[model samples]
Every structure is written in C-alpha cells, then in structure tokens.
Target: MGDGVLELVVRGMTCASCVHKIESSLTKHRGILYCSVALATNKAHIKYDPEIIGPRDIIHTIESLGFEASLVKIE
Candidate 1:
C-alpha cells in the first residue's frame, strides 16, 4: 500500500556494464519507481512500491545477475 526505499551493498561490480545490468533489471520490475547502481560506491539505491514487490525479490533479482547483494538499509 506504500512505497519503500531499499539500499543494498553490491559486490562484483567492476565496470559500467554491471551498473547498467543491475539498474535495468530492477527498473524493469513492475513496482520499481527508481533504481540506481553506483559502481564507485558499490551500492544500489532503489525506490519501489512494497505492495507490488519486497526485499527478497529485489535481492534475488540482483543476485541473479551474478553479483552479491545484501540489504544494507531499507526504509
């Protein structure tokens, strides 16, 4: 019923392609409002609708891209 912000610490992101892949993957999901991956910081900041998706699904999607992603913070 409300929106949520997800902050993740992502690993194995060595180049711009990794950022593109992760951003693309998350933004493609129905509930995702915004997604950003920072290769410099190795972090992903996402905004989404919780009614349509949750942390587990987001984490899974990130991991599926052959990277390690952990929930560093969520709001």
Candidate 2:
C-alpha cells in the first residue's frame, strides 16, 4: 500500500527527552512507517499507511503524553 504523511504542530517539548519520547511512542504504533519529532521546530513529521491509521490516532498518541498536538498538514 502507498504511504501517507502528516505534519503536526506539537507543543510542550522542552528538551531532547521530549523529542525522544514523542518519537519512541509514535514508532511503536502499527502502520507508522516513520516519525520525526523536532524540538527546534516544535513539529512532528510522520509517515504511515492511511488504510491502517488515521491522523486522529496519531494526534491522540501525542496528546496522551501530555503534549498539545494539532494537525498542520496531510499528504
């Protein structure tokens, strides 16, 4: 199946540990092909299979960690 991409504006990332937590949490989920969290940009770039997962699930995962995440873009 083809891949889907999503960009999220993630808030509350104070340091590299936050980045690591976000990345690690997301990568463990099914259908997530790639996840890149940037502390400098406060953004997350994720690639996944749309058929298996939607943007809401991804957003929930981020929010579950006590971070604020908003859908920035999708492709």
Candidate 3:
C-alpha cells in the first residue's frame, strides 16, 4: 500500500497501443499496486509504494520508453 497516489500527465500517447504499452510496463513493476492510462487525455494515475518507488521513477520510466511525461497536481 502507498501513503499517496500520484497522477501524471503523459504525453506522446498517440494510440491505444502506446497507452497499453506504458500501462503494461508500469504495472509489471513489483512496487506498483494499480495503474491506468487514459487514451482520451493521455493521463496516468498510479498507486505505488513510495518505499519501493516514487513519482520521479514513474516519470522517468515513461520517458525511458521514448515518451514524454510530467507531474501534474490537479486540485
């Protein structure tokens, strides 16, 4: 379980396959509890254990896959 959940705005998601690829890769990580990618808006909400992973790593992971991502706090 995580103390908090992080929502990120992921860019470069031009197709459903791209979204699935990202979601698939992220959820495969042991630290991630839940993950989803919205193809309509290119946003990803992730629940993860901070001890095992953090928001930075999540953003980096997406970028490492040749996509762009940034952290967004929507109030």
Best by TM-score: 2
Against the hidden true structure, what lDDT does model 2 obtain? 0.84
Regions more than 4 Å wrong, model 3: 1-3
User: How do the residues 1-75 of candidate 3 rate in per-residue lDDT, one tens digit apiece?
Assistant: 245577778899889889999999998888888888886877888886777997878888898897887777756
For candidate 1, give the lDDT: 0.83
Task: Give the poorly placed runs of model 2, Cα more than 4 Å off.
Answer: none
Q: Please give the lDDT score for candidate 3.
A: 0.82
1 or 2: which has the higher TM-score? 2
Say which prediction, candidate 1 or candidate 2, comes out ahead on lDDT: 2
Tens digits of per-residue lDDT, candidate 1, 1-75, equal 445877678888889988998898888999888888898889888886788998778888877888887776644
Ordered from best to worst lDDT, the candidate numbers read: 2, 1, 3
Task: Please provide the root mean square deviation of candidate 3 (C-alpha atoms, Å).
Answer: 1.9
TM-score of candidate 1 relative to the true fold: 0.86
The residue pairs found clashing in candidate 1 are none
Error of 2 at 15 (Å): 1.0
Model 2, 6-35: lDDT tens per residue?
A: 767898888999999999998998878899
lDDT for each of the candidates? 0.83, 0.84, 0.82
lDDT, residue 45, candidate 1: 86
